[PDB]
Amino acid sequence: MDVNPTLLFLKVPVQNAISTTFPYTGDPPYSHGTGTGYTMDTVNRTHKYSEKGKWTTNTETGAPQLNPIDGPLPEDNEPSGYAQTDCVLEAMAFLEESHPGIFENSCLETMEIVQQTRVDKLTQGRQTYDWTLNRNQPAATALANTIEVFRSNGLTANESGRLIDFLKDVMDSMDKEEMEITTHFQIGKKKQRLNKRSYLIRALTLNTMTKDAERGKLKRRAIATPGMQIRGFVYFVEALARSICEKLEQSGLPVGGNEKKAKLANVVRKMMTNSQDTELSFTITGDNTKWNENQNPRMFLAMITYITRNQPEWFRNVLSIAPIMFSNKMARLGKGYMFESKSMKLRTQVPAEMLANIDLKYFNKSTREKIEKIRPLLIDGTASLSPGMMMGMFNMLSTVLGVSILNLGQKKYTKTTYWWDGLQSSDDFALIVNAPNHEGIQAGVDRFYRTCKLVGINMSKKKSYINRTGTFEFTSFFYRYGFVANFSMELPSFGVSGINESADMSVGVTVIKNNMINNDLGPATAQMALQLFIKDYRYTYRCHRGDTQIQTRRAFELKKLWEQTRSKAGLLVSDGGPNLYNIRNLHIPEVCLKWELMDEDYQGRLCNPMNPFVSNAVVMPSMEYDAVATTHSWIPKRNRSILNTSQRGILEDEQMYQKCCNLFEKFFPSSSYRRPVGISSMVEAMVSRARIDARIDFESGRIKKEEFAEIMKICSTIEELRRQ
Amino acid sequence: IKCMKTFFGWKEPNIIKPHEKGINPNYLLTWKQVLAELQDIENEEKIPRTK
RNA sequence: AGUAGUAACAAGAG
RNA sequence: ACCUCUGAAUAAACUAUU
RNA sequence: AUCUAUAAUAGUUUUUC
Numbered sequence: 001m002d003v004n005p006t007l008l009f010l011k012v013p014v015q016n017a018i019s020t021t022f023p024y025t026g027d028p029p030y031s032h033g034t035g036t037g038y039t040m041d042t043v044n045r046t047h048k049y050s051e052k053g054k055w056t057t058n059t060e061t062g063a064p065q066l067n068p069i070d071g072p073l074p075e076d077n078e079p080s081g082y083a084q085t086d087c088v089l090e091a092m093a094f095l096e097e098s099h100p101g102i103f104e105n106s107c108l109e110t111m112e113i114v115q116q117t118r119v120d121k122l123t124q125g126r127q128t129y130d131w132t133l134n135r136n137q138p139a140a141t142a143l144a145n146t147i148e149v150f151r152s153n154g155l156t157a158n159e160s161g162r163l164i165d166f167l168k169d170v171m172d173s174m175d176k177e178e179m180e181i182t183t184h185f186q187i188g189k190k191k192q193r194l195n196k197r198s199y200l201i202r203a204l205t206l207n208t209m210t211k212d213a214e215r216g217k218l219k220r221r222a223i224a225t226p227g228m229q230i231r232g233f234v235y236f237v238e239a240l241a242r243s244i245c246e247k248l249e250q251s252g253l254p255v256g257g258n259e260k261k262a263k264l265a266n267v268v269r270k271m272m273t274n275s276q277d278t279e280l281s282f283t284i285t286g287d288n289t290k291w292n293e294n295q296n297p298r299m300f301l302a303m304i305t306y307i308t309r310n311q312p313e314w315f316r317n318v319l320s321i322a323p324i325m326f327s328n329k330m331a332r333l334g335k336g337y338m339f340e341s342k343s344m345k346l347r348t349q350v351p352a353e354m355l356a357n358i359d360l361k362y363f364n365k366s367t368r369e370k371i372e373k374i375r376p377l378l379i380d381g382t383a384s385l386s387p388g389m390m391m392g393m394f395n396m397l398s399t400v401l402g403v404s405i406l407n408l409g410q411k412k413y414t415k416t417t418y419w420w421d422g423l424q425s426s427d428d429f430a431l432i433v434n435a436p437n438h439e440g441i442q443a444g445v446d447r448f449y450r451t452c453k454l455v456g457i458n459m460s461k462k463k464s465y466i467n468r469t470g471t472f473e474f475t476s477f478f479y480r481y482g483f484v485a486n487f488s489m490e491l492p493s494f495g496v497s498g499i500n501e502s503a504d505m506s507v508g509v510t511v512i513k514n515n516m517i518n519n520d521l522g523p524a525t526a527q528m529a530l531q532l533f534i535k536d537y538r539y540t541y542r543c544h545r546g547d548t549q550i551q552t553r554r555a556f557e558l559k560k561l562w563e564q565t566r567s568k569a570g571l572l573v574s575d576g577g578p579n580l581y582n583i584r585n586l587h588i589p590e591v592c593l594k595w596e597l598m599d600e601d602y603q604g605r606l607c608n609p610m611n612p613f614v615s616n617a618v619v620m621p622s623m624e625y626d627a628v629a630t631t632h633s634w635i636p637k638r639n640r641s642i643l644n645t646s647q648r649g650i651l652e653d654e655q656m657y658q659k660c661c662n663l664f665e666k667f668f669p670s671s672s673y674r675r676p677v678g679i680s681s682m683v684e685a686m687v688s689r690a691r692i693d694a695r696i697d698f699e700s701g702r703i704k705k706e707e708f709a710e711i712m713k714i715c716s717t718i719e720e721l722r723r724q
Numbered sequence: 725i726k727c728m729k730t731f732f733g734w735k736e737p738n739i740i741k742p743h744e745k746g747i748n749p750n751y752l753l754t755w756k757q758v759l760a761e762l763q764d765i766e767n768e769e770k771i772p773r774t775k
Numbered sequence: 776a777g778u779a780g781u782a783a784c785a786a787g788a789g
Numbered sequence: 790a791c792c793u794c795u796g797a798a799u800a801a802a803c804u805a806u807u
Numbered sequence: 808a809u810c811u812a813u814a815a816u817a818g819u820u821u822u823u824c
């Protein structure tokens with residue numbers, strides 16, 4: 001008998017065994033070399049989707065720009081970016097007419113957000129494309145470099161600390177004739193002076209790379225990293241789009257998890273109830289083909305212009321900057337290529353900046369065609385990409401556009417016997433169509449498809465299907481008269497997370513508990529998951545039981561600790577103790593779970609604030625998944641690859657930054673608890689605080705006049721040093 | 725080493741199905757080197773964690 | 776050779 | 790050639806925990 | 808009855824010929 005696991009679906013409905021279709025136990029696919037090929041493919045495809053548009057040369061950067069707006073109406077079902085501006089404006093108008101006041105109230109909330117947001121909002125995130133180095137940097141590091149460069153060039157409006165003032169500084173930098181930077185090499189500092197067009201090309205540039213560890217995709221794809229100049233504008237536009245989306249029932253963003261599932265189920269059931277019993281109902285499990293390569297920044301500018309009608313001019317300008325910068329964007333080509341000589345047995349890296357005027361004999365046929373197609377667009381080492389939204393940006397504004405198209409499906413707008421509605425999340429959608437008969441269903445689907453074509457939305461025919469309402473798929477959630485559990489999606493979360501011993505134990509037990517609550521993880525499987533996690537935890541951290549003879553480097557110390565302990569159950573698993581977790585106590589931290597079983601001296605050593613592994617007191621170092629800090633809350637080593645580069649002065653600079661920050665925290669105790677705000681310098685703020693505190697201590701008699709005078713003398717000395 | 729000692733019948737190794745793209749005598753030499761170094765670690769009266 | 780798959784590793788840098 | 794260093798951080802939303 | 812704290816970390820979701 002040949003074993004056929006797929007035959008299980010003959011009796012178990014596919015949604016009820018959907019976990020079997022996710023092979024998430026093996027390693028995900030990765031990208032090995034460069035991303036230049038994928039980036040060039042994306043640029044060529046984006047320009048191909050708009051090839052019948054109008055070509056212009058940008059007067060400020062010189063980049064050729066393709067404009068598909070108001071292009072010819074398509075005659076086939078191929079993807080295209082020929083969105084009609086009047087159709088988009090009419091969709092926005094009807095969305096506003098069906099939900100009166102949505103844009104006005106969203107604009108009020110966004111005005112409050114714009115006026116109140118601080119500059120350090122930009123540090124939230126992993127990487128930002130640093131134009132001063134032509135590569136990705138940590139968001140805080142990129143922001144610090146940009147601020148230092150702006151200060152050296154007399155652009156100091158960001159000293160207010162507000163994000164909008166930083167955006168004003170960006171706008172002012174756009175008008176500087178020359179921007180100066182500083183470069184390091186093999187470690188001295190050199191000044192480089194960009195010109196206006198060079199800086200403008202750098203500021204409009206988004207970095208590109210490949211996406212690693214992506215599930216369900218046979219082929220790799222390119223992704224983007226926004227630069228420092230555009231991040232604030234994108235944040236403000238997305239804040240407005242979020243305010244709009246919060247007021248829309250069809251929106252799939254920004255609600256996630258159980259709240260999202262409940263909202264979607266309620267919306268679907270409301271649609272079912274509003275449907276007459278004497279009419280057919282069909283749901284479309286729909287995807288869109290190349291949503292971000294067909295949507296145009298000019299249409300987003302039009303949407304923002306319609307949304308911000310009757311608003312103050314400054315608000316309209318600050319919202320409009322982002323689509324304007326996105327319609328003049330450049331794309332970094334990437335690493336380039338590597339060339340291999342078989343006879344001479346050598347390999348070499350070809351930078352992407354040489355692809356403008358490199359001989360085409362080296363490349364193969366497909367890459368040569370890519371380079372030939374993209375060479376007219378190449379400028380200053382980047383590619384001109386006017387059409388398209390690059391990658392994972394303006395998702396909620398895309399949701400707004402999709403919801404407007406869905407909203408166009410009321411009977412007041414269709415003006416016929418059919419109507420539609422559904423769900424929208426960025427580009428993914430689900431559509432419910434009602435009609436007296438099948439002809440009406442076909443007509444409604446056709447009208448939805450053609451309206452989407454008008455606004456530049458192409459429904460992926462090969463990835464969409466339609467059936468009677470009751471089952472659909474939306475944003476990887478499988479609905480079979482209700483959302484079903486999908487355990488395989490959370491399966492990679494089980495295991496040793498890799499923070500430290502205490503945090504990893506907490507993560508393991510919390511993941512088991514959360515999957516019991518949410519993903520229908522049964523009690524027996526929860527116990528087995530706990531056993532497997534304990535096994536992996538003991539193997540990973542070399543913390544097997546003391547009464548075992550697993551030969552590790554740590555086994556002798558654990559044996560010694562086990563021998564001298566009286567109450568073995570009190571030892572943590574990190575110390576070789578037993579596992580006391582079961583279903584009933586998954587929610588309890590380990591140190592608290594076995595606190596009363598510990599020896600007094602072992603407990604005193606474990607929870608000793610004067611231990612070197614963690615920076616009547618308690619152990620404190622950012623204590624995620626670590627309720628009680630012990631000696632097991634240590635911090636692993638950082639990567640040392642930067643010591644071989646020219647950026648190794650950043651280590652000394654950050655050491656001095658940490659020193660100054662800790663000294664400041666010595667003056668403002670609440671600084672760590674809540675982020676301090678202020679335009680004054682650190683030394684000035686500290687001196688003022690010291691003076692007021694010394695005066696108060698003298699007044700209340702906590703210190704004597706001699707100490708007050710000494711503090712005043714030291715403050716005067718610091719003031720003297722401050723100027724010089 | 726103990727598992728190897730539990731088997732009697734070790735003949736002189738010879739190639740049965742060769743690797744068509746590789747150098748099979750290198751594989752034979754690799755196996756013989758493995759046997760030789762197993763004997764070496766067996767004869768050093770202190771078996772280490774790694775070889 | 777092998778891994779692997781639209782580009783790489785099969786050490787790199789000083 | 791010895792020697793020395795090093796083992797590699799997309800976006801957005803969400804979820805979990807602190 | 809209502810109910811997006813702030814921040815940090817990790818995880819999850821988001822494909823043309």
Ligand SMILES: [Mg+2]
Nearest residue numbers: 286287428475
């Ligand atoms: Mg979908």
